Every structure is written in C-alpha cells, then in structure tokens.
Amino acid sequence: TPLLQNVYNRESTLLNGNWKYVIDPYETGYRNHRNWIPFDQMAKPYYTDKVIKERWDRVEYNFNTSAEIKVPGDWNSQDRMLLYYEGSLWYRTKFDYTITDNNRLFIYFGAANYQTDVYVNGQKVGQHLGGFDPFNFDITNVVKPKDNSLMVRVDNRREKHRVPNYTTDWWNYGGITRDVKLVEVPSTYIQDYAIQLDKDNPKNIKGYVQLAGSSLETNVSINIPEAKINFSTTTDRTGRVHFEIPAKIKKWYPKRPKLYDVQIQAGNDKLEDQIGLRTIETKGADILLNGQSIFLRGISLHEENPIKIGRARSIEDAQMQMGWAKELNCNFIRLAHYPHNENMPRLADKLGLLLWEEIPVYWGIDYENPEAFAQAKSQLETMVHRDKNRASVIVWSVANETPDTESRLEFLRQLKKIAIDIDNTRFISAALERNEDVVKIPDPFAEDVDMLACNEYIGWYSGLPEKCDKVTWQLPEDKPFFVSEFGGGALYNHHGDKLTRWTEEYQEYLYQEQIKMLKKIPTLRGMTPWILVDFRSPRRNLPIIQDGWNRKGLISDGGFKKKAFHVLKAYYDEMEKKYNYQIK
C-alpha cells in the first residue's frame, strides 16, 4: 500500500501503551514446525488469537495471560532477557473502533525492525521489510465496532538477503520502535503530494497530488494563504494531477527557517502541512542555498537515546539531540545509517538544521541478489517519499562503505535513478572511502554524486595523529568536497598524555590535526565527524573502555562533553564567521 503523505498532521488514534507479547525463537506460532512453511501460505497459528471453548480443548498460547511490553520502543532495553534477542516476537493488543459512514481505516507504523507481519481478527493485512521506514495497511473491511484482535509479529533475525544483513557497527534493536496509530480518511483521500520549488525554475512551485480510494475523479485544491498562492482543478481516472505554479515567497534558511502553512484538499479530505521553500545546488566547488555560498558545519548521529540505552523515537529525543548539535554550533546533521523517526526532519524544518538522510546499504550487502535489491529499493522509495516536502533535507545518501565491484556499481546507479525519478530537488551522495603519501578517490560512483563525500580515520585506524599533517589530498576542483566521517574513540574522564589511546587528550589531539589537514583542501565545504554521542555496538568489546559502546562520541553515554567537543566547536565558530551572509 503506498505511504500516506503527512500522516504527521492527520488526526490519529494512538495504539501506544502496554501490549501482550510472546518470545518465539523457533517461530512455533508463525511456521509449521515440520516443513518450515508459514501458516499464512496454507487454532495453531498464534495470529488466530483463540482461547479454549471447552475445558478439554488444547491451545498452547494465551495472549490474555501473557507478559506485557511497552509500545513503542526497542525490546532490547526493556529487559536483560531481550538485550541480545535477535529473532521473532509476537505483540498483541485489543481496540474498539466504529468507522463513520464509508470512511477507510488505516494502521500506520512509524517503523519496526526488521520484518513485520500484521493481523487483525486473525486475518493477514500486511507484511513490511525494512527496520526504519514507515508503512500502513487499509484494515477497513476487517475491523468491527468492539473487541478487535491486533497481532503484529516483528522478526529482526540477521539474514543474507536483508538490508542490513550479517554485520553493522550498531546494535540490532528489534520490535515496534515508533508510534502505532489508526488513521480514518474519506472513501477518497489525499494519498501523496510534492509541493517544492522547481530546481530548473525557482520562480515556480512544482509538484503533484495523488488521490486513492473509491472514485479518484474529484476536485483538488492547494492553498498557501500567506503567499496569496492558489491552485484548484479536476483529477482524471488516475487520481493524479501535475502543476507548475509561480511563487514573493520568503525562502528557508538555517538562520531564518520560514515554514508556510499549506492546505491540501480533495473531495471531503482536508490536510494541513508546514513547508519551507529553498533551492540547493552545486556551482563548481561551491554549495549554494538560495544562491548563497554555505559551509556544512555538521555532526553524525545514530537514532539512539544513550541515557535509556535504547532507540530514540519522540519529539523530546529530537529536541535533546538537536540542542546538543546547536551547542556544537552545527547548521547540519548526518542522520545515522537509516531513516530516523519523522520528528527529526519535522523539528529540523522548524529549528533551521539542514539534514543528510541514508538507507542501511552498509558493507557486504548481497548486491547480486534480486531480493536484497528489492528491500534496499522499498526503503529508499519510502524514505524519499516521506520527507520530499522537507526544506531541512538537502542530501539523500544511498550507501555507506561499499565494495568496488561491478555488481555494486550498478546497484548504486539503479538506486540513484529510483531517488531521482521520485525527487530531483536534492543532492544524491554515498559515503565513500579513499586510496593510498597522497590520497585519491578513484571510485567510479564519484562521477555520479552531486557532493563528493568521503569517510577517513587517518588519526585513528590509519597511522597516529601526526600523519594528518604529512598527507596531501588530490581532488576534482569542480565539485564540493565533504567528509561524511572522521573521528576517534575516547572513554569520558579517562585522561592522560595525548599519545595514550582512548584518553580524551588523544581524541582532542586527533581532532586538532584532522581539522588542520582538511583546512588545506580548497574544495572542502562540510563535515559530519563520527560522532556526536557514544552509541551501542556489539563490535566494540574492549572491557572498561568500550563495554559495547562505540566511544567516538564528542559526548559520553551519560551526556557529558569530552575535550574534543570544544576543538570542533571553535573551528565551527570560525567557519560561521567566514561564511556569514545577508538574507535578501
């Protein structure tokens, strides 16, 4: 079912709360135990949610008497038992709901990692693959006024074909990780819409409205009152209409993040949105936001709440993380290795932070495998579609650290085309790697990126920090350069000499030398050092230092600033001063 645009501003019934759950490692409730075939495909299935009729009946499950779990949130941080659980878990709740007239009822999931199978009243309504991207199912025909069984199975088992697959550098947080809600919409409804400036013609707002449901030929209006902008017309059999409409509109900037109130209407459906308007482009080496030359003073960030040691999901998380970005004097954030919860780009639109958004194409994805390609494709489609009206987002990242194979090159070129054909307003990137005295990027996919993005750990994985000053970068003169990652591990309040690895002083030294090395590159235009805050990864098993944390944060797991924070902040204060500009 296509993603409903801007469910963020529709009226919802949250299903959040305490649900029933069963841990099911051998998939006893999903699969025939003898032939491994899902029950879906042919009492026993846990999704029928039966109880006994008579005292001599046998049912080896009972959601009514099962343990409870909080929704939303990762299961891992909810019990020591679930910390390392990689596998399948049944969530069950009940709700009453009477649909008005001939409206449609959707269930909308902000995210759930990794495979989700959803059942209403013992009837399958949908499946989703991808751990971080939203999804919704029309459940209209399968509900009843009282006592609805809602069964959602989430499976986070690592599998060859999944994106990501066997290893990443972050914790496998399983379960329903973001809000779950019912959404009631008219028999015909606004399904999708793009309302952004034309990259070929910034005088015009260019986009479309896509209707869905019972009768798709109806009247559609887009109203931007404060701009005196109006468009209205008829839809045809397709429910789709394109428009190129001109806009005295005040443009969106970090320092001045103007959001226009927008009204989207079709038949009986009314929908309000907050949309900022701006152009992002390349002019040789320069990055131009609305014709003005900018520098991206950025930081990398995982979707994690380190005080909770679990998945971030809320507007409160979004405020705390962005308040830290602002103490660091950032105008930009590189978000995780996956789509974060929609509060991030929504709050970034309001506060004036530019964004980079990424799908988990990470390391050894099975590039030759149609199935893997299909999962990477639906995650990117879902991500670009969700956020294509967000002024804050200026980069879609398609891959991070991928092998230089023919298999791989075609995969990334195909993903580029999928992103471009939905949205052509933003930069297409991929976080790449270098090649070694002097540093080149011969990556053929570097021809295909609007902003040349590289990861590099010269002070940390390759040589000690004195190597940074010895190094000369060799780069195309006609394209912005961007460092999508550099940094170093340090345990907060572990102090010593600057050559003692894992001390704050070593990380401080590394950032100093790293900033001196990058300041020599004339085409440098931004960086998202790794990372703003320590985050969980099961690849980081040094006792006392790591204990399952990646320690490359500028901020500790407790929320305490390390010495390196002040090195980067001071450089960013300097870059703010240099690229300081006057708004029209």
Add this chain to the structure above:
Amino acid sequence: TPLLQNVYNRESTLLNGNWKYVIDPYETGYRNHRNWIPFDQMAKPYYTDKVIKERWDRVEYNFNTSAEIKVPGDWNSQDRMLLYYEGSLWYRTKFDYTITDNNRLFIYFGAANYQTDVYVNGQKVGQHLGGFDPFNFDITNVVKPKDNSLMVRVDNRREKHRVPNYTTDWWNYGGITRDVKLVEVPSTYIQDYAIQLDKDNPKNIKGYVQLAGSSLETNVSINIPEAKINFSTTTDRTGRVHFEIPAKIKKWYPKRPKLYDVQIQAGNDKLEDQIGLRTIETKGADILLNGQSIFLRGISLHEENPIKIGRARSIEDAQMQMGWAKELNCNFIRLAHYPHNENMPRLADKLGLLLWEEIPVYWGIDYENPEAFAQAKSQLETMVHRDKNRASVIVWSVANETPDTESRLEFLRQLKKIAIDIDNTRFISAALERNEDVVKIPDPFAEDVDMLACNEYIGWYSGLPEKCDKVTWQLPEDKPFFVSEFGGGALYNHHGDKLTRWTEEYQEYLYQEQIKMLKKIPTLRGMTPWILVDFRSPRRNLPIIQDGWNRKGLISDGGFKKKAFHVLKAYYDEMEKKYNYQIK
C-alpha cells in the same frame, strides 16, 4: 582426529573453572566484517589473545579484563542475558603443562553446542560440528611449559544444514556443556578397542585393538583377572589386531549388572575399563537378553537438570535421574534426542538399566544436502564409538519423527549402514509415526529396524483418552513393537476433573486408557513414555501452564511426582512379575 576410547578411565588434567568470555553476535572476532570470510582461512582475530605493547596501540578486546563464566555448563542458565542467546561466544583460559619425554597431549571435550573452533597460542588446533558428541585434538607441537592461551569459540546459531536445524522441542543450550580436560598418552597409545560377547557364539569374547602414534608393531595384552583371561598378541604395521578369546563369565542383566575389570596394555600405555558381557537379539516378536525373553519397562529423558533449569553433565545428575527411573520401576531409559554425557551409559552399566541412544536427525533436516548428511554421520560415528563397550546400551536411534520422503529414506539407510560397520551387536531403530479406526506403520523404514518403535499421542494430540480403547493396531507379528513416546501435559498440583486438560487427573486418565490400548498388542515388548521430568522448550508458550516448559513430565520441574507416575509404576510392577526370569 579419531576419538580416544575410554578417556573416562585415563588420567586427565581438568580445565574446568571460571573462564574469560566475550559475547560476539556479529562474529567480529572470527570473520572479516566486509566479506564475511573467517580470519582462519586468510590483531583483529580474538584468538590471537593480544594485548597492547605501547599506550598508542589499538586492540578492541582484552580477555584479561573480560567478564567470567563457569565451564562446564550451558551459558543460558548462568545469566538472564544469555537465556535466549543464539550465536557465537568466546571462552578463554590459560594453563601450564610440561609434557613428559616424547608423550602426546590431547585436549578432550565431552561436548560443546554446536560449532567449536579451538586455538592454542593463537594457533588453530581443530573444529567440531555437533552439539552433544565428544572430540579431541592433538596439541603436542603447539603447547609450551607456561602461560598457554586456550581459546574456545562456540557458536549455537540455528542454520539450515545443521543437525538439528531450524526447530526442535527443546531449549538451544549453547556453550561448553561438559568437562574439558588434557589427556597425556605415550608416543604409541591405545586409540580404540571393542570387547563384547560374540553374538553368534556367546562362549567367546570378540573384538579388536587399534593403536596410534610412532611405532605401531608392539605387544598388546587384555587381562580380565576375575574371568581367568590372560590374552596376549602382537600388532602389524597398521596397529589394528582382531581377537577371539574363550570365556566362566557371569553375564550382565538389569537385575544383576556384572561388570568385569579389564586391563588393555600396549607398549608403555595401560588402560583400565569396566565392561559387562551380554547378548541382545530378536526372535520374531521376542527381545532376548542372554537368550531370556524380556520387556522394556522404560521412560524417556532429556539431558536437563530441572532444579538448575540448565544442562545435566555430572555423575550426580545421572544418580538423580536414574534414582527417579528406579522409583518408577524402570529397567530401560530412552535418552533424549542426542548423546547424553558419558556418565549416563557408565552408571547405567553400574545400576542395571538398559538404554536407547539417539542422534538429533529430527523433523525437517536438510536431507538433500550433503553437508547435513556429513554432520549426522560424524555425530553417529562419535556416539557409537564412545559407547560400543557399554552393556547398558542396546539401541542406536538414527531418527525421531522424520518426513516420509525418498531423500530421508536414503539418509536413514546410509546412517544404519555407517552404524552397522562400527558395531553390528546392538538393535538399530528410529522413532516413527503411525497412519490413520485402524492404526498401521506404512513407513518404508519400518522394514529396516530390528525393533519397531512408534511415537503416538492418541489421548492428547489426536482425540481424547476415550479414543485409546476404540482403536485397533495392525503391526507385523514378526518383529518386537515399542512405544518410543506417548504422554500428555499437566501442571503439577493443577487438579480437577479428568476431562480438564492440563490437570493431573487428565494425565492419570490418559495413562490408564493408553496402557489399556497397548496391553492388547501381542507384539508389544516395551515403552518409554514422554517423559520422566518436565523440561525446557521455547515451543511451549502457554502462560501459567507451560511458561517455557514441556509439561509432559511424570515429575514436576521442582521434582514432585504427579498422579500419572503411580499408574505407570503399578503397570511396571505387573510386567516385572509377568516377565520374571531365574538367571543361570
């Protein structure tokens, strides 16, 4: 590396204790994170057991500072965090050993589930696939006098090609589940031997001795002093010699379990064994022990200590389980779906219990895959080799509840042949299923088995207990019949009506009706009901009743007898009087 016979009686240095450990879900320590290839085949590898030399070096592990774990034991029962852990884990210890003269040093593992990779001083010494069968590696050339690093990786992740694979009805207990020890033997050592009554002429003892090492041509003696036997011979260049010694010998019977002290001696190597001498055979429908017709008053049993909720492993565990089998008036135990620890058959030798021993070819094994075959084969070979000198053991079981396909049938027939070529002296069987008024066993593999064993759950999975009496079994008049499983679930001290499922009264009633059904079958010569004591299974998810336990125990998880126990015992008291034999 061939299994050392009768290490049970050889002098060993136990490596049991507290070991260092790291949980490693993404196999960070074992495989390259980019291409997934094991470091083994090409600092990073956890098995190099490195520490930093200077303070600027980087090593993202340190076993010296890592958390500690009890060896032996399953990991799941040692911490709530490990209960559902399915994956790889690193165990690490250190040891000093001076080998005397030109002797060899073996490390011996009673079991580790599922895949063990073993390293000494950063050198790979061996791999083992199979979760319940012992294995030993020659480490002579790789140890030093002091401060040896011993690194033991164990992975219990469920995989398609493994035996067992995706699901069973018992808990995936990972780790070093039995004693680990060092066994020093001379440069020429007794590797293997068989010593059993000649089935075809019980006046004689038949067998072979297999020597291994530097000089294979030497004197070999076998003394059985009490029996007046002082056999002596020489070996050829192969070290393998066959023999036919007359017997004066008091034969082994459950009611009189006579074991002989045996000394096997070759060059400087000397081994004591305790061996019982008996014949087991079939005459049409009759089971003949030393030519006396017997009945197998049995119970099924998993290798689990219910008080610990963890894996059974010790002589103390054996004493408890078999104490309970003796209270039930058993002369027979069906051991689980895997080889139990070697204390079971050795104590079964001492106390006079006969035993069925099994490999986990169980449900949907990948019967077309040669890898899966190889892994079933190596477990079968190991089991038969370990226990072929135990009088208690009379059945090798090759399968439990496997699908009637052509691949499975060839798979089981190959297994039977492999078993026969090592040991032809015991019954070959498998747990088969009925077909349904009248009950037949059309399984083509029924023709291949010395004892026809059927699992059936008529009063429980198929019908209510009243069905037992309505049903008529049609079986060969030719071959002894065996009920390898029947039973029902019941929560200890949950009481009510005999038609209230999960009560003790329902179980009592099912046992009464089931016993009345089987007493009618003239070819019936034994049964091992499912099961002696409640055991853990993640397939059993019924809150209040199950809570992760299979509840078909005749004994509760706390060790309390349910009513159904007193029914089987009274039936076994009857069968004891009806099959009364006088030993000559």
